[PDB]
Design a protein around this nucleic acid. Structure first.
Ligand SMILES: [Mg+2]
Ligand SMILES: [Mg+2]
Ligand SMILES: [Mg+2]
Ligand SMILES: [Mg+2]
Ligand SMILES: [Mg+2]
Ligand SMILES: [Mg+2]
Ligand SMILES: [Mg+2]
Ligand SMILES: [Mg+2]
Ligand SMILES: [Mg+2]
Ligand SMILES: [Mg+2]
Ligand SMILES: [Mg+2]
Ligand SMILES: [Mg+2]
Ligand SMILES: [Mg+2]
Ligand SMILES: [Mg+2]
Ligand SMILES: [Mg+2]
Ligand SMILES: [Mg+2]
Ligand SMILES: [Mg+2]
Ligand SMILES: [Mg+2]
Ligand SMILES: [Mg+2]
Ligand SMILES: [Mg+2]
Ligand SMILES: [Mg+2]
Ligand SMILES: [Mg+2]
Ligand SMILES: [Mg+2]
Ligand SMILES: [Mg+2]
Lengths: 137, 106, 172, 98, 51, 197
RNA sequence: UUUGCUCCACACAAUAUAGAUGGAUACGAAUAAGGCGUCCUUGUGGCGUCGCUGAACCAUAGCAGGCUAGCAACGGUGCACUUGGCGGAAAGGCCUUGGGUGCUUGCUGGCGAAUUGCAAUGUCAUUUUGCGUGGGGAUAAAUCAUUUGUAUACGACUUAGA
RNA sequence: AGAACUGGCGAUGCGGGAUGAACCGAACGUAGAGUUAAGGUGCCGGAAUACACGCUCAUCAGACACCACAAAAGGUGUUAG
RNA sequence: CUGGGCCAGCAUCAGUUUUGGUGGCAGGAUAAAUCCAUAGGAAUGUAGCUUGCCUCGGUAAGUAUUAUAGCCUGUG
């Protein structure tokens, strides 16, 4: 090469409007927005659309998503809802392998015995037609 | 049907005990798949078996069973307590054990 | 002394025929239940006025819920405490959402650094530093910059099961 | 207190039988039982009074053919009944819906 | 011969104290309170929120 | 849950890993530990070199033969930390310890079998960044171990082999994907999708 | 010394077992970074994607899994063979070639099951060890004693004797 | 060595302090089920490698009352004041 | 072969207990908030406007208190 090469780790930052997935507690599994930064270990989050109440939360029980929308710092609940909506954050969440797997995981866990049986069969069905493919080239 | 098993796999860990005194009359079982007491509530009352081999045949059989049921949860991590008709042999700490899905309320 | 609640405690001297209607005195008190609150009210009163509870009565005890409990605030905290060898006054700041929140880290922070248990600490005044840049203690000024953003290097996901079939990554 | 069970016999070999509720997992699948007689079966039917009565055998077919009739309206239900249940590596009963 | 505890087994709960029948019947283990719009004087809130 | 669990003890902290293993045995899970020489210990090398030397200076005065036995290899150092946490003087103790094998490098039966890690004993996870630490194999030749280079040599040789194994395997799973694709988007596919599969 | 002895098959009577009951599922390396895919100048390279756990992947339906008839594939898999290779850290195992054979739940049919009576009681795993057969096989030494003195309290050590 | 009041040991096992007359908890007929005390819950070892904010890096760290000791004096280590 | 004797499973209960789900009420600043109306203000100053810089995209300083973001405090 003859450029200067510098790969810099590209972390999810905690920043107003960083949107976060809640790890533990009554609002588990739900998304909220980071509204303001209390300190290095604590932020203010609000999750209007998904029904998670504007609160001080320890950063440890939340995991930063890669999403971010535009939000003024320390915005009351209302304009979060306005802003979040505007930005179509749910829409972008749902589209991710992250959001999708969670769905899969829950779907799987919802199956009847009879449904598990059916998966087994169809999976057998697909198998057969794969192995042959795996032998024509 | 490679699988024929209608039970959850258990290990026999200990008698109930303090640091220096054990109660042979209760066994501490560790049910595979059970992390928390909340889970272990599922299995309470359900019958356990320890299955061992012998030399003398009895019911035309060289295999025997000691029976008992899961009775209450133990601690914070899904270990559960159990009493058996007789009392497990203590050589069996770390042996496998069997927890069936009956009595059922499913 | 734990999960804190803040209390108004209003009390007075017992009435005398000579002095019916004595003067009423108030404190803000941080305690976990109301018994310790009332008990604290006397502790202090006894040191300011000439009064013990056997010669006085407590008129009211009301919890003071934070007014704006979701607004992040910069707090001024003045403290008087006992070290092993002296007793001292001490100002420090705390950024949090409520007074009740703040006092709790205050109480922990005094133990962490100056090894001061709850008993050996008097909370002088606590107050919302109105105009930022009245904040003086850097370790709060640090969080006040425009568009403050920072990463959390070296993520350490806790594990649910004791064996793992993959070497973990710490990537946030 | 028992439960009348049928199999059905021609699907998995199990007869019209008695069974205790406390040794049974109640799955969340159901077949219509509207076309099925069933009112002749009681305790005294099963009463200990080898060989098999012709009644038992003929009753079987009567009840079965209706159930088998209803089972076939839904795919893979007929097979599901013939397969045996066994827990697999990684099944945790206290989680599974059934 | 055997102590029975009225806090269970309604029979001995009703043996002692008949009024339990009606107590239950009229609920009143709940029972809504009345209603009053009596607001607190200014000085009460001044001092409360005072420094 | 497995019959035998094989632990690549690389980047793990001696006593924590020791601890989980001692329990895993007492409950009847067969365990083999491998690559015991890339085991870590918290605190800088000198301290642990010093700590070991304490261990060394302990010997039955009238007969050093019966004295505490100072085993110098990483496996054996690690086996010390483990025995210490098992009641090895009882039959139950011995039985547990008979479910355990520890190796330096990864010898032939295991070299082609999957190893696992133990996150609650992983140095990188547990230790705070910046905090200094010690490598076992290096601690061992320091205090006498004779086979650090012989193992590294057999390890580099295993590593060539294992990576061509992996190159070939990775090339095969490529195929099954490019075999799959055809049915990845099939009608049965869609039906399985409806079920989380 | 009269019986023997050795390997492989499948065959009984004992005997033991720290504890089978779908599968121990193979890069290495970093973690203030990486995996995978793809292209290339094969590099500290360019683009794309993934994590947020194995809540995976694989396998799993049939008298503890029977009998029976077909279509569609040319696949899957088990067994005993066979062509090449590789593996010495304890390699005692791994990939690969060619048919043969059973099974195939990829699909469509014809039968069977009960009465073990409403759970007890149910699949038999692998160690040794003795005997039995049918085949292939191989046909010695050590000690006592006697002797040497490079040895020695006695044992032991070291020599020697067809 | 020697007095004061009380509670103990002696005469007394049980649970905790590894250990131990005297500490802590609690005093004892034969037992079942529950709950706790003092003390504990990485592994030995029954019980969260639990949650939370700080503090600390020791080429002699430190780790729990009775208790199995450390002082004057110093440090541009680092923290808060 | 049936009775006993003993053991066991289920069902309905009695005593002791442990662990879940769920309904209705009471109180407080008749919670505090969010939310809504409104008065007022500010800056870690949103839009405009002003001047140098520009790649005429944008940008900087300064002005400017809702505007082309919003926040705070009082009362209701
Ligand atoms: Mg990163
Ligand atoms: Mg116990
Ligand atoms: Mg069938
Ligand atoms: Mg360590
Ligand atoms: Mg011991
Ligand atoms: Mg990448
Ligand atoms: Mg990785
Ligand atoms: Mg690249
Ligand atoms: Mg996988
Ligand atoms: Mg059979
Ligand atoms: Mg080996
Ligand atoms: Mg049973
Ligand atoms: Mg001589
Ligand atoms: Mg005493
Ligand atoms: Mg005496
Ligand atoms: Mg005593
Ligand atoms: Mg001690
Ligand atoms: Mg020990
Ligand atoms: Mg334990
Ligand atoms: Mg740990
Ligand atoms: Mg002291
Ligand atoms: Mg200092
Ligand atoms: Mg009851
Ligand atoms: Mg508004």
């Amino acid at each position: 090469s003859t450029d200067s090469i510098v790969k810099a780790s590209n972390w999810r930052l905690v920043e107003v409007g960083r949107v976060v997935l809640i790890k533990k507690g009554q609002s588990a599994g739900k998304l909220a927005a980071i509204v303001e930064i209390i300190d290095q270990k604590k932020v203010l989050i609000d999750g209007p659309k998904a029904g998670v109440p504007r609160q001080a939360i320890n950063l440890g029980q939340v995991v930063l998503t890669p999403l971010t929308f535009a939000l003024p710092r320390g915005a009351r609940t209302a304009t979060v809802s306005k802003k979040w909506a505007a930005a179509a954050v749910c829409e972008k969440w749902a589209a991710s392998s992250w959001a999708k797997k969670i769905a899969q995981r829950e779907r799987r866990a919802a199956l009847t015995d009879f449904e598990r049986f059916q998966v087994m069969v169809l999976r057998k069905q697909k198998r057969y037609t794969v192995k042959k493919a795996l032998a024509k080239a | 049907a490679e699988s024929h098993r209608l039970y959850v796999k258990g290990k026999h860990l200990s008698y109930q005990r303090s640091k220096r005194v054990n109660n042979p009359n209760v066994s501490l079982i560790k049910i595979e798949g059970v992390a928390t007491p909340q889970d272990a509530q599922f299995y309470l009352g359900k019958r356990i078996a320890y299955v061992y081999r012998a030399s003398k045949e009895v019911r035309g059989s060289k295999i025997r069973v000691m029976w008992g049921k899961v009775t209450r949860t133990h601690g914070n991590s899904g270990v559960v307590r159990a009493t058996f008709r007789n009392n497990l042999p203590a050589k069996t700490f770390g042996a496998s054990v069997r927890i069936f899905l009956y009595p059922s309320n499913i | 002394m734990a999960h804190f609640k803040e209390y108004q405690v209003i009390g007075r001297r017992l009435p005398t025929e000579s002095v019916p209607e004595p003067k009423l005195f108030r404190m803000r008190i941080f305690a976990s239940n109301e018994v310790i609150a009332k008990s604290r009210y006397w502790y202090f009163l006894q040191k300011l006025h000439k009064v013990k509870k056997a010669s006085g009565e407590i008129v009211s005890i009301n919890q003071i819920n934070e007014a704006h409990p979701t607004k992040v605030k910069n707090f001024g905290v003045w403290v008087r405490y006992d070290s092993r060898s002296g007793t001292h006054n001490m100002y420090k700041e705390i950024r949090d959402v409520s007074r009740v929140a703040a006092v709790e880290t205050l109480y922990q922070d005094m133990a962490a650094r100056h090894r001061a248990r709850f008993r050996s600490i008097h909370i002088l005044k606590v107050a919302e530093i109105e105009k930022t840049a009245d904040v003086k203690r850097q370790y709060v000024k640090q969080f006040l910059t425009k568009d403050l953003k920072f990463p959390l290097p070296h993520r350490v996901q806790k594990s649910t099961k004791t064996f793992s079939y993959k070497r973990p990554s710490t990537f946030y | 207190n028992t439960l009348l069970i049928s199999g059905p016999f021609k699907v998995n070999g199990v007869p019209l039988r008695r069974v205790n509720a406390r040794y049974v997992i109640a799955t969340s699948t159901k077949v219509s039982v509207e076309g099925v007689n069933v009112e002749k079966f009681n305790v005294e039917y099963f009463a200990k009074e080898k060989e098999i009565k012709a009644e038992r055998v003929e009753d079987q077919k009567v009840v079965d053919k209706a159930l088998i009739a209803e089972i076939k309206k839904t795919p893979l239900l007929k097979q599901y009944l013939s397969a045996s249940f066994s827990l697999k590596n990684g099944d945790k009963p206290h989680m599974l819906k059934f | 011969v055997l102590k029975k505890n009225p806090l269970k087994n309604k029979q001995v709960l009703l043996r002692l104290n008949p009024y339990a029948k009606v107590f239950a019947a009229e609920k009143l283990g709940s029972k809504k309170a009345e209603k009053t719009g009596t607001k607190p004087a200014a000085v009460f809130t001044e001092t409360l929120k005072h420094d | 849950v497995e019959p035998v669990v094989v632990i690549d003890g690389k980047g793990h902290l001696v006593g924590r890993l020791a601890s989980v293993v001692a329990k895993q045995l007492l409950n009847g899970q067969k365990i083999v530990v491998v690559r015991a020489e890339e085991l870590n210990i918290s605190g800088e090398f000198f301290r642990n070199k010093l700590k070991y030397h304490d261990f060394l200076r302990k010997a039955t005065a009238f007969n050093k033969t019966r004295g505490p036995f100072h085993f110098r290899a990483p496996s054996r150092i690690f086996y010390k930390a483990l025995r210490g946490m098992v009641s090895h003087k009882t039959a139950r103790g011995k039985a547990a310890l008979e479910r355990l094998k520890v190796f330096e490098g990864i010898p032939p039966p295991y070299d082609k079998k999957k190893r696992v890690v133990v996150p609650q004993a992983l140095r990188v996870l547990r230790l705070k960044p910046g905090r200094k630490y010690t490598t076992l194999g290096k601690l061992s030749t320091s205090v006498g171990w004779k086979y650090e280079d012989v193992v590294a040599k057999l390890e580099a040789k295993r590593k060539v082999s294992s990576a061509e194994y992996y190159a070939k395997k990775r090339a095969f799973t490529k195929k099954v994907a490019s075999a799959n694709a055809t049915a990845a988007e099939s009608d049965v596919a869609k039906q399985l999708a409806a079920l989380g599969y």
